[PDB]
Structures are given as structure tokens and as C-alpha cells.
Amino acid sequence: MVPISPIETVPVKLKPGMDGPKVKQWPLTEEKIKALVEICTEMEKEGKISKIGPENPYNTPVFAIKKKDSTKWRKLVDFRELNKRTQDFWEVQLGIPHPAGLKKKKSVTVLDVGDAYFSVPLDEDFRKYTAFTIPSINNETPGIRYQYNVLPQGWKGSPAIFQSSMTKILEPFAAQNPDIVIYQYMDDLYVGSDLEIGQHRTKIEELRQHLLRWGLTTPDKKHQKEPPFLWMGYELHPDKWTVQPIVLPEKDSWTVNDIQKLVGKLNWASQIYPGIKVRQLSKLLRGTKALTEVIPLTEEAELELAENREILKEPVHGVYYDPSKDLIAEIQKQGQGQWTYQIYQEPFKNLKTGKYARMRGAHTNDVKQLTEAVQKITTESIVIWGKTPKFKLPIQKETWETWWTEYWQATWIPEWEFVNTPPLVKLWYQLEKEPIVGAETFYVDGAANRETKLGKAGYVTNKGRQKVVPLTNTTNQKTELQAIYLALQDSGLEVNIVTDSQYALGIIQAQPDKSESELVNQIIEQLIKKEKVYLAWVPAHKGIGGNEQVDKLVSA
Amino acid sequence: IETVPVKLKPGMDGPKVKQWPLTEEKIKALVEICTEMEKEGKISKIGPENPYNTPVFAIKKKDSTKWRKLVDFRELNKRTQDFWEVQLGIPHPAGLKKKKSVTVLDVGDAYFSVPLDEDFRKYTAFTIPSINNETPGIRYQYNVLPQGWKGSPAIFQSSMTKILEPFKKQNPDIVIYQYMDDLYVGSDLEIGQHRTKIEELRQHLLRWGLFLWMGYELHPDKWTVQPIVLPEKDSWTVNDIQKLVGKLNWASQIYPGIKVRQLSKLLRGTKALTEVIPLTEEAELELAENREILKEPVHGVYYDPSKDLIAEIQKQGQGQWTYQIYQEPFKNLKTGKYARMRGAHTNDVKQLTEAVQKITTESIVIWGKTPKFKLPIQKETWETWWTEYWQATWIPEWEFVNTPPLVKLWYQ
Ligand SMILES: Cc1cc(/C=C/C#N)cc(C)c1Nc1ccnc(Nc2ccc(C#N)cc2)n1
Ligand SMILES: NCC(=O)Nc1ccc2[nH]c(=O)[nH]c2c1
Ligand SMILES: [Mg+2]
């Protein structure tokens, strides 16, 4: 006997105040019982389970399933009840690696660890909770009772405990072999390196020897598995990666569910295929939720779809990360709140692509959206590469400076350079900081009756220009905007506007270039045509001249 | 030695807080620091049976070549029991803010000499993440009192009192106040003498059984404030008068006696914004009466230790920031303004982060607690950048203002 190091057990507890499962065992056919007896007999021989006495109060149901078409039975224990009662664990495999963060490898070998998979010992004190019963033939004898000595398949703590145990075993090998990488997925280990094939092969044997110290055998028969690997929806190749094939279906009629599937594929595709757009297609999914309901595709959605098909016509691949080179991120505006980006090191070879969509809200502008896209790409890049890319942005340096210096919020974007690739992000208007000499002064107001919803909006000016418009189906807030709109509409290229509306100031000081409000949009259109606009606020009902007059007129 | 038992408040589990993404340089720094700490027995690796997490990162303090581990214990601190039994409270010295110089020392390293209660250690779990999650995050918990944790100053307090005994009896005028990992030492004496006494204080800690060398000098007696002030002008435009009436209307929510009636009538008629309006003598009297009112303190302003402090900040432009600290609206316990630079001239977010730190420091000196911030910035922008500029060993609470305040105008 060659002594092996034991694997230390992780201490496990039930959730506070909870006891173990007591669940009735289903009756089974005579054939299932016999097959389970045989399976458990074998498992018992290997030390995976042990027979127990009647004293253990616990039970979990056991099943037997024949695969599809076949004569072979396998044992399935239904752990649902025990899982509800088992403590939460630290889960490591959250946050899977992104292929674009991986490094190219000359060789990647797969090692079958299935032996270890079913061999990790279970905490001695927790074993009683895993009890199960094979029903007896005809129910004329007590059922055969067993509990697990090892991590059971399907138990809540099995994946975390297996991963942590394997990791601890592998740690010294990884540390003392900085020239390889090791990754564990299911019952396999993947070992890559850049070593010349002889040295690589030697590292693999050494790893097999290292694992032997815990008694973990790997088959002499070497893995049929070779690159490319199909993993987590990706194809990984030694020098490149892509997403697994994406084929958009041909359809005469589109179901809600069909459209959800389409968007899913497109979203998945967008991390490599540059320029993917989901806006119009996603719109069709609003409200509803009835899965089998068919929707007509709008002309816009048809167009988006056709554009996507073109983008998807042939395979595209990403390259891997070279830590010795800068990361560059370039962003383009696509229209309708849509933004697309590429991240690369060398020109024309992307590591990855992606998209950003405008956040929901009443009012917005391109600069805010661009800023949000930058922050998102920044955060994604920290995750994947541990660093911020240098940005190439379709906005002039002077535009950005004018923006951030005058914007009411603190705002910043990291190191970036202008790339001239229309459409450019620009400021459509900027209001004056001081009142304009020589420019006509419009005092605006509006009011509405909450009940009848009748209202008025208008202005009076220092030149004695005046307007009042009667309005139906309106609110006080709408009349306040309407009044500003009228002053813009009726003034020359330079204008001073005086309003008491805190609501309107709040919106305009947010500097929107687009709005869900038709009225805000009309105001923006008017601002764009002006040379100079000064907007001044005053408190209502203070006896402020020209403000009180117009207030009088618009009230009743 | 011989740990004090600690518990979470009743009906709550330990923190599970996601580790946020860390740069390569911060990860490398943390791996190095933690390897040493593990060697020193301060922390130990943990297993998958520990579900808990608290975020960690690393900072660079003022003029230093070395990273400092910073754990964000904000969630754990909320969930940790308040400290009552032996110490019922730390009545806050009101004299600290009056001192000519207050130096801030990082004393946090002293905490590592006290073992942490064995049943509570699991709640201190933290993770060093790996780039692109390529290798499993390195999981640790504390064996001793962690820096940044609420319980550490509470638990260490008896040791601290004994340590500083000879310095205090020797230096009776010197005010020493402790908040989290910081010690605040005030003195009214000459700055060269002050530094001498500070270095004298270091030795007490240094000579005992062991970023302490550092110090951060404040002069709270020079801390200024911002009364409401109105323009003094020879010629007022219609616009000037509108801005004045607007400012006075706002002020009248604070100071009740304020009147706009006479001033508002200067605006009679519909006039060009830039036209100059002579003040009527009744307008001048009203303005005069208003000025006098604004020279007085706000009425019924008092600090309540049972209530949160709230801090609002406005960007004034050109590196200028104004702020107010209050409990109830319109009762400001402190107002202030920073015209400062300290780099950051091209970076708004850096400036804001520095303002947040300064205001928190002022808050700690004055009330002995940190305020809750209302920050003029989008969540995503703040959350992406603030850790890059953070120099402080504590972190306050914040929320985000998405709607531009009209009152920025009146603090300008
Ligand atoms: C995450 C991961 C998944 C698999 C495999 C999962 C599966 N199935 C295999 C390995 C070795 C890794 N780990 C790492 C770490 C750093 N660089 C790389 N680069 C890299 C990986 C695979 C190929 C290929 N072909 C090329 C380069 N892999
Ligand atoms: N006085 C009006 C005005 O300066 N408007 C304006 C509009 C768009 C701009 N883009 C800039 O970089 N500066 C701008 C200024
Ligand atoms: Mg009105």
C-alpha cells in the first residue's frame, strides 16, 4: 500500500432551527428495487454509502430510471427536501471567465477527474441527513437503509465542496508551475501552456503524479477531447475564440416566444459580431407575456432583422488577450438610444464587441448616454482584463469640455481620444449664463383647472408683444411648458425668457436633446434654432412685474 | 488576549456583499499584503462552508509608496450589535473642534494584537478576486480585530486607555479622540511643538509591543462657514432684482422675518431683463431689514444624536463646491465651501470624492459620526470611480441626486 493523503472534510450544517428531511419513499416496481439493490451493493463495496440501522429518523426518496432506449438502470436520489434545509455555501463558479480575457495557448490538455468526482468524503456529522431507503420486494421486510459517505450527486453542497477540495489539491501544483494554467470544469481538468510539446507533456505527467498523492487516478487512456472546445456557449480554439453557431430562423409569423429567442441569440451574438441591434425587435415584447401570442413585425423590426442577418452572414472570431499591449475601446452611436463598441489591441482584430442601450427615462441626451456606455465598458474591462481601455469616442474634445464644465452634475470619463466617425455626439444647445442685452424679454406663464382640464398658456414682453392660447385636456405642468414653447416660437434669434416654473427649469437644466414628451421635443427643436437663450426663474405670486400680469391672463 | 464575545443584532445573518471588480494592481497589492497577514496569523484561509462576504480593495494614502488594505465593512457594521455592556458610550469632546491643530493618526494596526471572538470570525469573510475569474477567488477571514470594523475600537478601548495613560496625565490640555482606525489629537500650541508632541505620542504606541508615522494636520479653529449674504450694488438690473427676490424667498423658509414685498414692486411693469432699476427708499429699507435678519443665527437649531446627519453638496464650477450638513431641512448645523484644487482640476469626480472625505472628517471632529451624503452625480459614474480617489480608512453612506437643485444658485 502506498499511503495517500486524505481529503479534509468541510464541516456542514443545516439552516438554523431546521431539522433533516423526513420524506416518504415511493413504492417502486420489483424490477427497480432489484436494480437499486445491485447498484447500492456495488456503491457500498466502494465505500460511497453504508448501511444504517432503524434508529436514524431521516429519509430522502430514491428513484430508478432507465435511460431513453436502453436496458441499464441508474440510481437517482431526490435531494430537494434536504437541499431546502442545507446551509448556503460560497459559490465560486459564479462569474465564469470571458473568452476575450483568456491568453492564447500552444497546447491545452484535458484530464478526466471523474474518479475524484464521486470520491470526496462527506462531513461525518452530516451523513445521517443523507439517509435513504430501498423499498422491500412486496413490502414484507424492512427496507434497506443507507447513508452517504461521499458528496452525493444532486446535493446542494456537492459542487462547492468538490470545487474547493480540488482547488486546494491543485494549489501547490499551480504555484510551483507558473508556466501552465489549470481550469476545472465538471469532472474534467484543462491544462494549458506555451511550453514546447515535450515539456508540456512532462507537466501533464507530473500533474498526474501529483494527483496520485490523494489517490486520484486518471485514465492512462488519454483524452479524445482536443481543441476546439465547446464551452458555455463558446468555441475555444488555441489562438482564437467565437460564439457557437448562431442561425436566425426564417419565419412567416413571429410568436412572443419566437421573438424572445431571437433577441437572446442576438444578445449572445453581440459579444463578437460587431453592430448587432436589438431595439426594434425588443419593443415587440412590451407588456403582454402571453407566450404563444403572435406579433406583426413592424417595418422597423424587419429592417433591424435584415441588418442583423447581414452581420451574421459569415463566421467572425475574437483574438485572445496580450497583457503586454494596451486595450483600446471604440464606440459608435447607432441611433434610438443604441450604442455599439469594439475592444481591440491590434487594428482589425477584436478581442470582443458589445452593445449598450439607453436607460429608461422621460428625458435624455447623447452625451449622458455616451458617458453611461463608457462607464459600462470600463467596468466590464476591469472584470475581464483588470484595466481600463483607452477610449476612442465620436465626440470632439471641445464639446466634452464645454459639457462637463457647465453640467450641474460631477461627471468624468477616463483617458480618451476623438475619432471622427459620424454620427458625432455634439451639444445641440447651450443656454446663456447672463441675460442678453438687446434681446426681447418674454415673461411666460400657464395655468389649468384640475377638474375641467381647461387651461391657458402665454407671454407678455417688454416690447408689448403678447399672446394667450386657450388649451383643452391639459395640466398646469403642460401649460408651463407650452408657454415657454410659445415664447421660443415667437421670438427672434436671441431671447430672454422669464418663468416661474420649477418643473420646467428642472427639465431644461437637465439639458435633454430628446424626450418622451412631445412638448419637450418641440421646445428642444426651437432651442436648436436660436443663437442665444437666457432662461431666468422667479418665484410665483410675488408681485414680480410681467410675471404677475401674464399669470393673471392665463389663470382666468 | 481572551476575546470578548460579539454578536450580530437579533434576526439578521452575516453580510453577503458582492466583491466589486478590482484592477490588476489592486489585486496584486492585496495578494502581497494578505500573504504577509496570513503569515502573521492575522487572517486565515476559509472554506466553502462560509457563505459570507464583505468587499475589499486597496488605497494609497497621502504621500506613500505602499498600498493599504481597505475593507468595506459598512454592511457588517450595520449588522453588528451596538456596544453597551462595559462601555455605555463615548461622550463626544466638544473641545476637539476648538483646537488650533488636530492631527489624525492611523492607529488601526494596534487592533491586530487583539484576538477576534471565534464565533464571530466567519462574518469577516472577504475575497481576493482573480482577473477574469480565471482562478478561484482567495477566501480569508480575520483571526483578530479588523481595521474598519465597528467593534474594533469598542473592543480595543480598554487597551487604548491604558496605552495613552502616561501621555494624557503628562499632557492634560491635549485632546485625544478616537474614531474607527483614526486617532484625533488636538493642541493649541506652536506647530513645531505640536508635531513634537505628536511624535512623542507615536513612541508610546511604537514602544509598545510592535502607517503610524503618518499624520494629517487639520486646523478646525480656522474652519469657515457660509452665512446668507446679499449683493451690495449701486445699480440693479431687473435681472439682479429677480435673483435677489428669488434668493430672499428661499431664505425666508429659513429666516421667517424676511420680506420681499417692497423689492418685488420694483419690477412693476414688464421690463427688459437688463434694464437698470433705481431702488425706492422703501425697497432699500426692506433690503436693509433683510440684511440685519441674515446676520442672526437660524432659530431653533439643535443637534440630536439620535438622528442621522445629512450632507448635501453642489458643484459650483471652476473647482468650487458648496455643502450643507443638517438633520432637519432648513436647519443647517454647518454650511461650507471648498474653492480648493489638490490636483483634480480636470476631474470632477476626483474633486467630489475629496470633498466627500473632507466633509466626513469635519463631521467626525464636530459630532463624532459620519453623515449620509446626497451626491450630485449619476450612480454609475460614482460607483465606477470613487475607490480610485479614496484616501480614508472609513466610508460613509451616500445616495444620488438625479434632479438639479434650484438652490445651487443661492449657495453660490
Ligand atoms: C477558463 C479556461 C477554460 C478552459 C476550457 C474549457 C472547456 N471546455 C481551459 C482553460 C485552460 C481555461 N483557463 C485559461 C486561463 C487563461 N488562459 C486560457 N486560455 C485558453 C484556453 C483554452 C484555449 C483553447 N482551445 C485557448 C486558450 N485559459
Ligand atoms: N451661446 C450659445 C452657445 O455657445 N452654444 C453652444 C452650442 C453647442 C456647443 N458645443 C461646444 O463645444 N460649445 C457649444 C456652444
Ligand atoms: Mg402663475
Short mmCIF file of C-alpha atoms in Angstrom, two decimals, chain A residues 192-520:
data_model
loop_
_atom_site.label_atom_id
_atom_site.label_comp_id
_atom_site.label_asym_id
_atom_site.label_seq_id
_atom_site.Cartn_x
_atom_site.Cartn_y
_atom_site.Cartn_z
CA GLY A 192 -2.79 24.83 -20.99
CA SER A 193 0.68 26.22 -21.62
CA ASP A 194 3.12 27.67 -24.14
CA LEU A 195 5.77 25.04 -23.42
CA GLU A 196 7.33 23.08 -26.23
CA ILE A 197 5.25 19.92 -26.55
CA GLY A 198 7.80 17.70 -24.78
CA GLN A 199 7.88 19.91 -21.69
CA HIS A 200 4.09 20.33 -21.79
CA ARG A 201 3.67 16.58 -21.91
CA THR A 202 6.04 16.26 -18.95
CA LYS A 203 3.97 18.77 -16.95
CA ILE A 204 0.88 16.67 -17.61
CA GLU A 205 2.54 13.51 -16.28
CA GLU A 206 3.81 15.41 -13.24
CA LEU A 207 0.26 16.61 -12.60
CA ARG A 208 -0.99 13.02 -12.85
CA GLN A 209 1.70 12.05 -10.33
CA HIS A 210 0.74 14.94 -8.01
CA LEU A 211 -2.90 13.85 -8.07
CA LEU A 212 -1.88 10.29 -7.18
CA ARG A 213 -0.82 11.53 -3.75
CA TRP A 214 -4.52 11.90 -2.88
CA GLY A 215 -5.24 8.59 -4.56
CA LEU A 216 -6.88 10.27 -7.53
CA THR A 217 -6.39 8.11 -10.61
CA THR A 218 -6.59 9.44 -14.14
CA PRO A 219 -7.05 7.04 -17.08
CA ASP A 220 -3.92 6.06 -18.99
CA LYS A 221 -6.19 6.36 -21.98
CA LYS A 222 -5.62 9.97 -22.95
CA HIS A 223 -8.49 12.33 -23.69
CA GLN A 224 -10.15 12.11 -27.10
CA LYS A 225 -11.02 15.74 -26.37
CA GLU A 226 -8.88 18.27 -28.21
CA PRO A 227 -9.40 21.90 -29.26
CA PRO A 228 -11.77 23.33 -30.36
CA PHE A 229 -13.77 23.09 -27.12
CA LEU A 230 -17.50 23.77 -26.91
CA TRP A 231 -17.84 25.57 -23.58
CA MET A 232 -20.54 27.80 -22.02
CA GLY A 233 -21.91 28.72 -25.47
CA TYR A 234 -18.47 29.41 -26.92
CA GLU A 235 -15.93 27.77 -29.20
CA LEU A 236 -12.46 28.00 -27.71
CA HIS A 237 -9.52 27.43 -30.09
CA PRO A 238 -5.80 27.66 -29.21
CA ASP A 239 -5.34 31.09 -30.85
CA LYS A 240 -8.94 32.36 -31.21
CA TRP A 241 -12.48 32.18 -29.84
CA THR A 242 -16.04 32.64 -31.05
CA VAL A 243 -19.63 32.06 -30.00
CA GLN A 244 -21.18 28.76 -31.03
CA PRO A 245 -23.11 28.95 -34.36
CA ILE A 246 -25.94 31.45 -34.45
CA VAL A 247 -28.59 30.91 -37.11
CA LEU A 248 -31.63 33.16 -37.29
CA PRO A 249 -34.75 31.22 -38.38
CA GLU A 250 -36.84 32.06 -41.43
CA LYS A 251 -40.44 32.81 -40.40
CA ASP A 252 -43.70 33.98 -41.92
CA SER A 253 -45.21 34.62 -38.47
CA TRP A 254 -43.49 35.61 -35.21
CA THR A 255 -44.56 34.42 -31.76
CA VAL A 256 -43.70 36.24 -28.47
CA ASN A 257 -41.57 33.24 -27.54
CA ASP A 258 -40.01 33.21 -31.03
CA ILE A 259 -39.03 36.86 -30.57
CA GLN A 260 -37.63 36.25 -27.09
CA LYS A 261 -35.47 33.51 -28.58
CA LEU A 262 -34.36 35.80 -31.42
CA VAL A 263 -33.26 38.57 -29.05
CA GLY A 264 -31.47 36.01 -26.89
CA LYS A 265 -29.42 34.82 -29.87
CA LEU A 266 -28.71 38.39 -30.94
CA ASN A 267 -27.62 39.41 -27.45
CA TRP A 268 -25.34 36.38 -27.30
CA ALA A 269 -24.01 37.16 -30.78
CA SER A 270 -23.26 40.78 -29.90
CA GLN A 271 -20.15 39.98 -27.84
CA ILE A 272 -18.32 39.11 -31.10
CA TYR A 273 -20.36 40.19 -34.15
CA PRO A 274 -19.96 43.98 -34.29
CA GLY A 275 -23.02 46.21 -34.73
CA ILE A 276 -25.84 43.89 -33.58
CA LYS A 277 -29.08 45.83 -32.81
CA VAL A 278 -31.95 44.60 -30.58
CA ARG A 279 -34.05 47.83 -30.17
CA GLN A 280 -36.95 47.38 -32.58
CA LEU A 281 -37.22 43.62 -32.06
CA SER A 282 -37.21 44.04 -28.26
CA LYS A 283 -40.06 46.59 -28.46
CA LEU A 284 -42.45 43.87 -29.64
CA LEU A 285 -42.06 42.17 -26.24
CA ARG A 286 -43.63 45.01 -24.23
CA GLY A 287 -46.36 44.21 -21.69
CA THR A 288 -48.18 41.06 -22.77
CA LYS A 289 -46.17 37.95 -21.70
CA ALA A 290 -48.62 35.52 -23.26
CA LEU A 291 -46.01 33.22 -24.75
CA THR A 292 -47.89 31.83 -27.73
CA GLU A 293 -49.22 35.18 -28.97
CA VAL A 294 -48.10 36.17 -32.49
CA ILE A 295 -46.98 39.75 -33.25
CA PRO A 296 -46.68 41.58 -36.58
CA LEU A 297 -43.15 42.78 -37.20
CA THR A 298 -43.05 46.50 -37.85
CA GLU A 299 -41.16 47.78 -40.89
CA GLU A 300 -38.52 48.92 -38.39
CA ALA A 301 -38.17 45.47 -36.82
CA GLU A 302 -37.96 43.85 -40.26
CA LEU A 303 -35.17 46.27 -41.14
CA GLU A 304 -33.27 45.62 -37.91
CA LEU A 305 -33.60 41.87 -38.51
CA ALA A 306 -32.33 42.14 -42.10
CA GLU A 307 -29.37 44.21 -40.87
CA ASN A 308 -28.58 41.52 -38.29
CA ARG A 309 -28.74 38.69 -40.85
CA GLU A 310 -26.14 40.55 -42.93
CA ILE A 311 -23.85 40.95 -39.91
CA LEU A 312 -24.30 37.21 -39.21
CA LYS A 313 -23.66 36.03 -42.80
CA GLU A 314 -20.22 34.56 -42.07
CA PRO A 315 -18.25 33.49 -39.01
CA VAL A 316 -16.36 36.10 -37.00
CA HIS A 317 -13.75 35.29 -34.34
CA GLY A 318 -12.17 37.20 -31.45
CA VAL A 319 -8.48 37.02 -30.52
CA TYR A 320 -7.08 36.42 -27.04
CA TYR A 321 -5.57 38.92 -24.62
CA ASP A 322 -1.94 40.03 -24.78
CA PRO A 323 -1.09 41.65 -21.41
CA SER A 324 1.92 43.37 -23.00
CA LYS A 325 -0.34 45.57 -25.15
CA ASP A 326 -2.78 48.42 -24.47
CA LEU A 327 -6.50 47.77 -24.64
CA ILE A 328 -8.40 50.07 -26.95
CA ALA A 329 -12.16 50.58 -26.91
CA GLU A 330 -14.04 52.34 -29.70
CA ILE A 331 -17.73 53.29 -29.53
CA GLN A 332 -20.25 54.33 -32.23
CA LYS A 333 -23.74 55.85 -31.84
CA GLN A 334 -26.31 53.69 -33.67
CA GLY A 335 -29.49 55.78 -33.20
CA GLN A 336 -32.59 55.28 -31.00
CA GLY A 337 -30.58 55.05 -27.79
CA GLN A 338 -28.39 52.31 -29.24
CA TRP A 339 -24.62 52.20 -28.91
CA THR A 340 -22.09 49.63 -30.13
CA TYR A 341 -18.43 49.04 -29.24
CA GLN A 342 -15.29 47.10 -30.18
CA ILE A 343 -12.37 46.29 -27.91
CA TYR A 344 -9.02 45.54 -29.51
CA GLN A 345 -5.25 45.56 -29.14
CA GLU A 346 -4.09 45.45 -32.77
CA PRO A 347 -6.12 47.12 -35.52
CA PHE A 348 -8.81 44.98 -37.14
CA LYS A 349 -8.53 42.17 -34.59
CA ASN A 350 -11.16 42.47 -31.88
CA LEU A 351 -10.95 40.74 -28.54
CA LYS A 352 -14.68 41.31 -28.15
CA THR A 353 -17.54 43.54 -29.18
CA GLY A 354 -20.73 44.57 -27.41
CA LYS A 355 -23.63 46.99 -27.19
CA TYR A 356 -25.24 49.43 -24.74
CA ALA A 357 -28.88 50.58 -24.68
CA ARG A 358 -30.21 53.94 -23.41
CA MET A 359 -31.71 53.74 -19.92
CA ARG A 360 -35.44 54.25 -19.49
CA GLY A 361 -36.42 57.80 -18.59
CA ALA A 362 -38.52 60.81 -19.52
CA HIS A 363 -35.62 62.83 -20.93
CA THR A 364 -32.13 62.07 -22.15
CA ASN A 365 -29.24 63.29 -24.29
CA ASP A 366 -26.43 61.70 -26.34
CA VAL A 367 -23.62 62.86 -24.04
CA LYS A 368 -25.18 61.27 -20.95
CA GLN A 369 -25.72 58.04 -22.90
CA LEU A 370 -22.15 58.03 -24.22
CA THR A 371 -20.92 58.59 -20.67
CA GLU A 372 -23.00 55.66 -19.39
CA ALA A 373 -21.69 53.42 -22.16
CA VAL A 374 -18.12 54.38 -21.22
CA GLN A 375 -18.72 53.51 -17.56
CA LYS A 376 -20.22 50.13 -18.54
CA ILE A 377 -17.32 49.25 -20.83
CA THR A 378 -14.90 50.39 -18.13
CA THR A 379 -16.46 48.11 -15.53
CA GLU A 380 -16.65 45.16 -17.95
CA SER A 381 -12.96 45.71 -18.80
CA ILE A 382 -11.90 45.72 -15.15
CA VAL A 383 -13.66 42.36 -14.79
CA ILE A 384 -12.14 40.81 -17.87
CA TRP A 385 -8.67 42.40 -18.12
CA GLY A 386 -8.18 44.15 -14.77
CA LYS A 387 -7.69 47.51 -16.50
CA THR A 388 -9.45 50.40 -18.22
CA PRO A 389 -9.09 50.52 -22.00
CA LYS A 390 -8.09 53.68 -23.82
CA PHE A 391 -11.23 55.06 -25.46
CA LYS A 392 -11.86 56.27 -28.97
CA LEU A 393 -15.06 58.30 -28.92
CA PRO A 394 -17.12 60.08 -31.62
CA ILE A 395 -17.19 63.39 -29.71
CA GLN A 396 -14.91 66.42 -30.08
CA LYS A 397 -12.62 67.30 -27.17
CA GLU A 398 -14.06 70.84 -27.09
CA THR A 399 -17.61 69.50 -26.96
CA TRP A 400 -16.76 67.32 -23.99
CA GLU A 401 -15.05 70.19 -22.21
CA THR A 402 -17.99 72.54 -22.78
CA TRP A 403 -20.28 69.77 -21.50
CA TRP A 404 -18.68 68.72 -18.25
CA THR A 405 -17.57 72.14 -17.09
CA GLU A 406 -21.12 73.54 -17.28
CA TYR A 407 -23.12 70.40 -16.42
CA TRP A 408 -24.78 70.61 -13.00
CA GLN A 409 -23.53 67.13 -12.01
CA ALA A 410 -19.98 65.99 -11.40
CA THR A 411 -19.05 63.83 -14.36
CA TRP A 412 -15.89 62.31 -15.81
CA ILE A 413 -14.68 59.89 -18.47
CA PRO A 414 -11.24 58.25 -18.44
CA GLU A 415 -8.42 58.75 -20.93
CA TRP A 416 -9.86 59.03 -24.41
CA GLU A 417 -9.30 60.47 -27.88
CA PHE A 418 -11.68 61.82 -30.53
CA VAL A 419 -12.26 59.64 -33.57
CA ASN A 420 -14.05 61.29 -36.44
CA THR A 421 -16.64 58.72 -37.44
CA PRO A 422 -20.13 60.18 -37.98
CA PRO A 423 -22.58 60.49 -36.46
CA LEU A 424 -20.75 62.67 -33.94
CA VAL A 425 -22.10 63.40 -30.49
CA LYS A 426 -22.50 67.17 -30.12
CA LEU A 427 -24.24 69.69 -27.91
CA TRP A 428 -27.41 70.82 -29.70
CA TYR A 429 -27.88 73.89 -27.48
CA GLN A 430 -26.27 75.71 -24.55
CA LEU A 431 -28.14 78.36 -22.54
CA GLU A 432 -26.59 81.74 -21.66
CA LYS A 433 -25.08 82.40 -18.23
CA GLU A 434 -26.16 86.06 -18.27
CA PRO A 435 -29.20 87.93 -19.62
CA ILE A 436 -28.83 89.14 -23.19
CA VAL A 437 -28.56 92.89 -23.86
CA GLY A 438 -30.75 94.00 -26.77
CA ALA A 439 -32.75 90.76 -26.73
CA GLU A 440 -36.53 90.93 -26.19
CA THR A 441 -37.67 89.69 -22.76
CA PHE A 442 -40.62 87.22 -22.64
CA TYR A 443 -42.45 86.72 -19.35
CA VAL A 444 -44.23 83.39 -19.65
CA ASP A 445 -46.90 81.59 -17.66
CA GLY A 446 -49.59 78.93 -17.87
CA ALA A 447 -52.30 77.52 -15.64
CA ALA A 448 -55.01 74.87 -15.85
CA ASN A 449 -58.12 73.83 -13.96
CA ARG A 450 -57.57 70.36 -12.43
CA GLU A 451 -61.22 69.38 -12.97
CA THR A 452 -62.23 70.67 -16.41
CA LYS A 453 -58.61 70.34 -17.56
CA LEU A 454 -59.06 73.65 -19.41
CA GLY A 455 -56.04 75.94 -19.42
CA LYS A 456 -54.14 78.83 -20.95
CA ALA A 457 -50.54 79.49 -21.85
CA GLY A 458 -48.81 82.64 -22.99
CA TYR A 459 -46.42 85.54 -22.61
CA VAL A 460 -46.03 89.30 -22.41
CA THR A 461 -42.84 91.13 -23.44
CA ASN A 462 -41.02 94.42 -22.82
CA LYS A 463 -41.97 95.38 -26.40
CA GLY A 464 -45.64 94.86 -25.56
CA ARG A 465 -45.76 91.67 -27.62
CA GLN A 466 -48.40 89.38 -26.09
CA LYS A 467 -50.05 86.02 -26.66
CA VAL A 468 -52.52 83.83 -24.81
CA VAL A 469 -53.65 80.47 -26.19
CA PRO A 470 -56.69 78.56 -24.81
CA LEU A 471 -55.99 74.87 -24.20
CA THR A 472 -58.03 71.72 -23.56
CA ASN A 473 -57.17 68.41 -21.88
CA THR A 474 -54.08 69.91 -20.24
CA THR A 475 -52.42 70.16 -16.82
CA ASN A 476 -50.60 73.02 -15.10
CA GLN A 477 -47.23 71.41 -15.85
CA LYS A 478 -48.07 71.12 -19.55
CA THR A 479 -49.26 74.73 -19.73
CA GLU A 480 -45.97 75.87 -18.16
CA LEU A 481 -44.03 74.11 -20.92
CA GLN A 482 -46.43 75.33 -23.59
CA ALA A 483 -45.81 78.92 -22.53
CA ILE A 484 -42.03 78.54 -22.87
CA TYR A 485 -42.58 76.95 -26.28
CA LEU A 486 -44.70 79.91 -27.42
CA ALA A 487 -42.00 82.43 -26.38
CA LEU A 488 -39.34 80.46 -28.28
CA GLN A 489 -41.64 80.17 -31.31
CA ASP A 490 -42.46 83.89 -31.40
CA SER A 491 -39.08 85.47 -30.58
CA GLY A 492 -36.06 86.29 -32.73
CA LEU A 493 -32.65 84.58 -32.66
CA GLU A 494 -31.76 85.95 -29.23
CA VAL A 495 -34.29 85.86 -26.41
CA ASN A 496 -34.62 86.31 -22.65
CA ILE A 497 -37.31 84.11 -21.08
CA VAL A 498 -38.69 84.55 -17.55
CA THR A 499 -40.66 81.70 -15.97
CA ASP A 500 -41.88 80.76 -12.52
CA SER A 501 -41.97 77.05 -13.33
CA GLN A 502 -39.64 74.97 -11.17
CA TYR A 503 -40.84 71.96 -13.17
CA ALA A 504 -39.72 73.44 -16.49
CA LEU A 505 -36.39 74.62 -15.07
CA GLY A 506 -35.71 71.13 -13.73
CA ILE A 507 -36.19 69.62 -17.17
CA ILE A 508 -34.26 72.23 -19.14
CA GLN A 509 -31.36 72.31 -16.65
CA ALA A 510 -31.06 68.55 -17.33
CA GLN A 511 -30.15 69.53 -20.91
CA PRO A 512 -32.20 66.91 -22.82
CA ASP A 513 -31.80 66.56 -26.57
CA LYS A 514 -34.73 64.11 -26.74
CA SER A 515 -37.83 63.38 -24.69
CA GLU A 516 -40.82 61.10 -24.27
CA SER A 517 -42.69 64.39 -24.06
CA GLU A 518 -43.80 65.77 -27.40
CA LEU A 519 -43.87 69.24 -25.87
CA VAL A 520 -40.30 68.95 -24.54
#
